[PDB]
Amino acid sequence: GSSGSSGVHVEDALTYLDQVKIRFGSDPATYNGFLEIMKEFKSQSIDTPGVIRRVSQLFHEHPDLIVGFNAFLPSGPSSG
Numbered sequence: 001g002s003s004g005s006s007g008v009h010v011e012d013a014l015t016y017l018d019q020v021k022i023r024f025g026s027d028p029a030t031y032n033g034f035l036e037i038m039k040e041f042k043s044q045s046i047d048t049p050g051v052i053r054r055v056s057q058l059f060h061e062h063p064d065l066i067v068g069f070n071a072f073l074p075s076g077p078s079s080g
């Protein structure tokens with residue numbers, strides 16, 4: 001039919017995390033850069049709009065990853 005899976009978990013952070021490794025299994029350079037950008041966020045050097053800017057330049061050939069991440073974010077307009 002179609003490649004779709006509805007119903008995510010409370011913490012889908014680990015899901016997309018490993019997905020990048022499976023997608024770019026033959027391209028370690030792309031995955032390495034992904035980790036570097038994550039480090040900047042871990043150091044609080046960049047914010048939400050900041051990390052997005054980097055992703056938009058790294059995964060320029062894969063907009064799906066950046067777009068899907070918008071919904072793959074637990075923290076949002078939810079009650080909390």
Ligand SMILES: CC[C@H]1ON(C(=O)OC(C)C)[C@H]2CN(CCC(C)C)C(=O)[C@H](CCSC)N2C1=O
Binds near residue numbers: 012014065073
């Ligand atoms: C969802 C899996 C995975 O995807 N992440 C990610 O950056 O995807 C983009 C590169 C497309 C990383 C980076 N961010 C960004 C935060 C910003 C405030 C939007 C995340 O929130 C946490 C990492 C920090 S919390 C552990 N994270 C994930 O959970």
